[PDB]
Amino acid sequence: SMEQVAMELRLTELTRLLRSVLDQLQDKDPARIFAQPVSLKEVPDYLDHIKHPMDFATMRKRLEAQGYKNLHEFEEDFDLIIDNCMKYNARDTVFYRAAVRLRDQGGVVLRQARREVDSIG
């Protein structure tokens, strides 16, 4: 139907805007701490601690399959990156501190993204 196409165009454009958001958030991680999944070879107990692992490469795979229906779903995954790190790692670690900085810096980006998503519809 024509309506299905219109909906698919909206999803495509949301995907465009989320790709730009994703790039901007990932620049706030210049150490690449959150770039890839935590290695279960190197952290064999990880899944005992963290039930829903997340990282930027996994988000990018979902994104490119148009797997985010709305900004809320995308933010959920971003928040998992931060929140998982802040539980697994202690406060005095480069990892925890990197997550805090990513959260704080990403807030700004996400605040305007929400306005653009509502504004453009």
Side-chain angles (χ1 to χ4, degrees), residues 19-33:
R19 191 179 300 115
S20 172
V21 175
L22 184 62
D23 292 343
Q24 282 175 71
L25 294 175
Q26 188 156 25
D27 289 333
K28 311 312 185 163
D29 174 32
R32 299 194 67 86
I33 290 165

Side-chain angles (χ1 to χ4, degrees), residues 2 4-6 8 11-15 17-40 42-60 62-68 70-110 112-114:
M2 203 35 245
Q4 288 297 318
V5 172
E8 295 164 354
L11 178 63
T12 295
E13 285 305 293
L14 173 69
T15 305
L17 177 160
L18 297 182
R19 191 179 300 115
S20 172
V21 175
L22 184 62
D23 292 343
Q24 282 175 71
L25 294 175
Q26 188 156 25
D27 289 333
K28 311 312 185 163
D29 174 32
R32 299 194 67 86
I33 290 165
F34 306 106
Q36 295 292 330
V38 171
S39 180
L40 305 178
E42 305 170 354
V43 189
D45 73 354
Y46 188 63
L47 301 181
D48 293 349
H49 292 270
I50 297 301
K51 298 301 175 184
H52 298 99
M54 194 44 57
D55 66 271
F56 287 130
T58 304
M59 292 189 63
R60 198 174 293 281
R62 186 162 163 194
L63 183 59
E64 292 307 336
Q66 300 190 344
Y68 296 111
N70 57 50
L71 184 56
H72 180 75
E73 289 187 348
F74 176 100
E75 291 173 312
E76 292 199 321
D77 273 357
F78 178 66
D79 282 336
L80 278 175
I81 294 176
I82 299 312
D83 291 339
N84 286 349
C85 185
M86 293 175 71
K87 290 171 192 71
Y88 189 82
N89 301 109
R91 218 157 28 250
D92 72 327
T93 62
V94 66
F95 310 108
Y96 184 110
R97 287 158 175 284
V100 166
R101 293 165 60 82
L102 178 61
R103 191 194 61 182
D104 285 350
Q105 297 200 278
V108 181
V109 177
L110 290 169
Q112 205 45 47
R114 163 53 64 205

